[PDB]
């Protein structure tokens, strides 16, 4: 259910 | 351009030798004819009812007068008012069909537009014209205008190493293509020569030439002449026989072939314009102004052909209306003077294009005279053969 | 009053000119009045939510047994996708994650009538889609990534270096190449770059990021001239700065320099960054993706540059196109700092083929074919607009006049 990702946005 | 930019005196006394009012000056490269479309006010692509009916109703009445005139008298006249009559009637034909080759281009009525492709069906039938073939033929020249090989359907110059070719192909000039050749380019004949242009109308009568979308346009288009030759012809000859034949369709079917070929022949021929192939020296703009020539006519026949000489004030803008078409070539010479070139209604320009300018020669890229050239070509065969004998 | 032979050579001028600036403001209208939609695009299309397809079997089976049938609009499906299957993801920084996801995306989205893959003979069947430094004459099957460890410190090939390439061609462009390449040390970098075709007059597109243990040490991203006045179009100039306007707001404009070998390529307006925190970079990402997406809907209405034959002007704009790209070509392969650590891993006799026949190769008479499949657009359009065989349309007007005897 997490992201993990990475975007501009935090 | 082929006599440019030398004192103006020389180009006066050929135009007195020409018969021709004026001669063009100078024009560079890399214009577009529809360039000095901007000049023109904005109230001169106007619409009005008035000036059209006029131009449409004009000419039928004039015609409408010389059938009256004959069938008060159908064929008890003499031979001279016959050839009156005649004339009269071609002449309001030619003016209806110039009513109609502006209806062709859509710039007659453009608010209806299937009215007008339909009066301009109808008015190209009795001359047995098909619409769309016209159309087609009329872009093609715009298209190609004094390009050498490319424009057949204007009038097309014959050269010189073609008719070479000829002369070694028939082996002599006592074939039958030859003497054809001279005999149709020597005679006022040439001055019908427009006839052999509507035999090169039905392209076969053959739908390959066309784009496959437009083949029940096509079709529709050579249906409305051959009905007129089914239908309307057969009457007339059932009513009236061979004579009355000869009579009251013949002759102002030769009166408007004659003032469709004089019209042309004399608007794009002149020896003070080249004929080049494009990649070796050609232009849009140049080959449209500089290549011209605009004819004069008494305001009554100007009123009855409706501007019928008036040729580039729409190649210029090819929207501008036909009630227009002086009005703007009095703002034209304001502008390109100096460049146009002009002419009047002379029998001895007719008789300089029947005996003085017949061919067209590359190198000196001019018009010269059938039997000096062909004698001319005749002691070059007699050089390739003192080359030969060895 | 009449007029000279010089000025109507300067009123086809002053047509031509006018013609030009049409056009040029013609391309950036649609971009000027919303930029943060270059950007934002994806976030929009999330908010506006699965869409409910309605085709006549689509409602059939829904209305048979239960079934609903979602789509999604094409930024959602390249957001679900992400890195997809590239084969040496779950190493690499996230950074760059985002990054690749968003490009390729980006190429698939807007150029998906004639996106070919390049022809597999130049790059594929060499095995130059997964390189490895530890298998460099590929005798694992380019399982290599897998089937070997690390080595440790002091052993031989100690630091291994992998690199992992995909290249398009298309309409356009030629090539569009995207490449990812990993250390041990903790370096990876992502070197993208867009060529169009010789026939074209734009710039060539060019984005670098090298990143040292998870800390972005460099990001450049030029949209690149080609002509030899090393000056834009006004589209292309005035988007860069529209752009610079609205994502770079509030950066360091001093931080932008003009790097020894960057004059040359660079566009007044490219970017040269070594970013210091977190809004530093989110500006520069943000920033690099509206400006990509920017390039390719631009390209999206591009003309080709003819030569007719006695037209000299365009066959000296064609050579100029020529001499541009092969300068960026041969001025790009100098950017050592990739290539010395390519060679310091893969040797030289093997970098030299790589790079000569992948990395910036330059072959002016060899430019890939592609394929036009946009007559797709047909099938999919006559799915959601169909013509039923008119039987239906007697038993529809019994229908219509039947329920409407209330
Ligand atoms: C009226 C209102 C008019 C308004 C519209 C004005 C439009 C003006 C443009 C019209 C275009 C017409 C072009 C005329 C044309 O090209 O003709 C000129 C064309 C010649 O033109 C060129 O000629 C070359 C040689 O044949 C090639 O055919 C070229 O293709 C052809 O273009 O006429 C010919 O085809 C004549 C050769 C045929 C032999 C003639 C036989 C005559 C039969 C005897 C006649 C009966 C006895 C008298
Ligand atoms: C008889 C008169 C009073 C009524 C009107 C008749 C026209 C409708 C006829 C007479 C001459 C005919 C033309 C005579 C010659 C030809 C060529 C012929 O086609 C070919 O010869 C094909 C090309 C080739 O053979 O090289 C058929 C079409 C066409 C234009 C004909 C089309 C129909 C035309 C114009």
């Known amino acids: 259910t997490t992201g993990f990702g990475w975007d501009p946005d935090g | 351009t082929s006599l440019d930019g030398l004192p103006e005196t020389q180009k006066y006394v050929y135009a007195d030798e020409w018969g021709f009012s004026r001669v063009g000056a100078d024009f560079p490269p890399g214009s577009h004819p529809s360039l000095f479309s901007q000049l023109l006010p904005q109230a001169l692509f106007a619409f009005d009812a008035r000036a059209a009916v006029a131009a449409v109703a004009v000419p039928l009445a004039a015609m409408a007068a010389g059938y009256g005139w004959l069938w008060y008298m159908h064929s008890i006249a003499p031979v001279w008012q016959q050839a009156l009559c005649a004339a009269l009637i071609g002449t309001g034909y030619a003016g209806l069909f110039k009513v109609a080759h502006e209806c062709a281009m859509m710039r007659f009525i453009p608010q209806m537009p299937g009215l007008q492709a339909a009066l301009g069906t109808l008015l190209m039938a009795p001359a047995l014209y098909s619409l769309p073939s016209w159309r087609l033929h009329h872009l093609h020249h715009l298209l190609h205008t004094n390009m050498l090989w490319q424009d057949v359907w204007g009038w097309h110059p014959l050269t010189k190493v073609e008719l070479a070719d000829e002369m070694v192909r028939s082996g002599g000039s006592g074939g039958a293509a030859m003497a054809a050749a001279r005999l149709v380019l020597t005679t006022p004949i040439k001055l019908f020569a427009s006839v052999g242009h509507w035999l090169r109308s039905w392209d076969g009568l053959d739908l390959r030439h066309f784009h496959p979308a437009s083949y029940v346009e096509v079709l529709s288009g050579w249906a409305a002449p051959l009905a007129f030759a089914g239908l309307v012809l057969p009457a007339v000859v059932s009513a009236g026989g061979l004579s009355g034949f000869v009579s009251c369709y013949l002759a102002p079917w030769l009166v408007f072939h004659f003032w469709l070929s004089v019209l042309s022949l004399t608007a794009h021929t002149a020896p003070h314009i080249p004929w080049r192939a494009e990649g070796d020296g050609w232009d849009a703009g140049r080959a449209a102004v500089a290549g011209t020539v605009t004819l004069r006519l008494p305001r009554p026949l100007e009123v009855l052909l409706n501007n019928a000489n008036y040729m580039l004030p729409q190649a210029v803008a090819p929207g501008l209306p036909m009630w227009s078409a002086p009005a703007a070539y009095a703002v034209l010479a304001a502008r390109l003077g100096p460049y146009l070139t002009e002419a009047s209604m002379s029998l001895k320009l007719l008789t300089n294009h029947v005996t003085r300018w017949q061919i067209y020669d590359e190198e000196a890229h001019t018009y010269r005279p059938m039997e000096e050239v062909v004698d001319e070509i005749e002691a070059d065969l007699q050089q390739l053969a003192a080359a030969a004998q060895q | 009053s009449p007029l000279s032979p010089e000025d109507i050579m300067r009123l086809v001028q002053q047509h031509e000119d006018v013609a030009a600036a049409a056009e040029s403001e013609q391309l950036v209208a649609q971009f000027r009045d919303d930029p943060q939609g270059l950007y934002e695009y994806v976030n929009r299309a999330y908010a506006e939510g699965p869409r409910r397809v309605t085709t006549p079997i689509s409602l059939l089976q829904e209305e048979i047994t239960g079934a609903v049938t979602e789509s999604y609009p094409a930024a959602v499906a390249n957001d679900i996708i992400g890195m997809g299957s590239w084969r040496?993801?779950?190493?690499?920084?996230?950074?760059?994650?985002?990054?690749?996801?968003?490009?390729?995306?980006?190429?698939?989205?807007?150029?998906?009538?004639?996106?070919?893959?390049?022809?597999?003979?130049?790059?594929?069947?060499?095995?130059?889609?997964?390189?490895?430094?530890?298998?460099?004459?590929?005798?694992?099957?380019?399982?290599?990534?897998?089937?070997?460890?690390?080595?440790?410190?002091?052993?031989?090939?100690?630091?291994?270096?992998?690199?992992?390439?995909?290249?398009?061609?298309?309409?356009?462009?030629?090539?569009?190449?995207?490449?990812?390449?990993?250390?041990?040390?903790?370096?990876?970098?992502?070197?993208?770059?867009?060529?169009?075709?010789?026939?074209?007059?734009?710039?060539?597109?060019?984005?670098?990021?090298?990143?040292?243990?998870?800390?972005?040490?460099?990001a450049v991203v030029d949209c690149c001239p080609v002509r030899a006045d090393l000056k834009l179009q006004p589209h292309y100039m005035e988007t860069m700065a529209l752009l610079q306007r609205t994502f770079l707001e509030g950066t360091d404009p001093a931080?932008?320099?003009?790097?020894?070998?960057?004059?040359?390529?660079?566009?007044?307006?490219?970017?040269?960054?070594?970013?210091?925190?977190?809004?530093?970079?989110?500006?520069?990402?943000?920033?690099?993706?509206?400006?990509?997406?920017?390039?390719?809907?631009?390209?999206?209405?591009?003309?080709?540059?003819?030569?007719?034959?006695?037209?000299?002007?365009?066959?000296?704009?064609?050579?100029?196109?020529?001499?541009?790209?092969?300068?960026?070509?041969?001025?790009?392969?100098?950017?050592?700092?990739?290539?010395?650590?390519?060679?310091?891993?893969?040797?030289?006799?093997?970098?030299?083929?790589?790079?000569?026949?992948?990395?910036?190769?330059?072959?002016?008479?060899?430019?890939?074919?592609?394929?036009?499949?946009?007559?797709?657009?047909?099938?999919?359009?006559?799915?959601?607009?169909?013509?039923?065989?008119?039987?239906?349309?007697?038993?529809?007007?019994?229908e219509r006049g039947a329920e409407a005897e209330r």
């Not at chain 3, 996230?94 to 390049?118: N, S």
């Not at chain 3, 993706?289 to 030569?307: D, F, G, I, K």
């Not at chain 3, 060679?343 to 992948?358: D, H, P």
């Open chain 3, 88 to 218: 040496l993801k779950d190493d690499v920084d996230p950074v760059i994650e985002f990054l690749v996801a968003r490009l390729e995306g980006c190429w698939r989205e807007i150029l998906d009538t004639d996106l070919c893959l390049y022809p597999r003979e130049k790059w594929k069947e060499q095995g130059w889609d997964l390189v490895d430094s530890m298998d460099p004459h590929q005798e694992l099957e380019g399982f290599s990534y897998a089937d070997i460890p690390d080595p440790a410190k002091g052993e031989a090939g100690y630091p291994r270096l992998q690199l992992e390439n995909r290249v398009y061609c298309s309409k356009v462009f030629r090539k569009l190449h995207v490449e990812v390449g990993l250390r041990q040390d903790g370096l990876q970098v992502l070197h993208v770059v867009v060529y169009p075709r010789y026939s074209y007059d734009m710039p060539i597109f060019g984005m670098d990021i090298v990143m040292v243990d998870g800390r972005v040490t460099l």
């Open chain 3, 255 to 398: 931080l932008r320099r003009i790097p020894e070998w960057g004059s040359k390529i660079f566009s007044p307006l490219a970017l040269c960054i070594t970013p210091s925190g977190p809004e530093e970079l989110a500006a520069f990402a943000k920033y690099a993706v509206a400006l990509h997406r920017a390039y390719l809907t631009m390209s999206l209405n591009a003309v080709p540059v003819v030569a007719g034959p006695g037209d000299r002007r365009e066959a000296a704009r064609l050579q100029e196109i020529q001499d541009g790209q092969k300068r960026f070509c041969d001025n790009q392969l100098v950017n050592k700092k990739t290539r010395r650590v390519l060679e310091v891993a893969m040797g030289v006799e093997w970098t030299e083929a790589y790079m000569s026949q992948l990395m910036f190769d330059f072959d002016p008479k060899y430019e890939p074919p592609y394929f036009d499949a946009s007559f797709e657009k047909l099938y999919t359009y006559f799915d959601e607009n169909p013509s039923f065989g008119e039987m239906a349309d007697e038993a529809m007007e019994l």
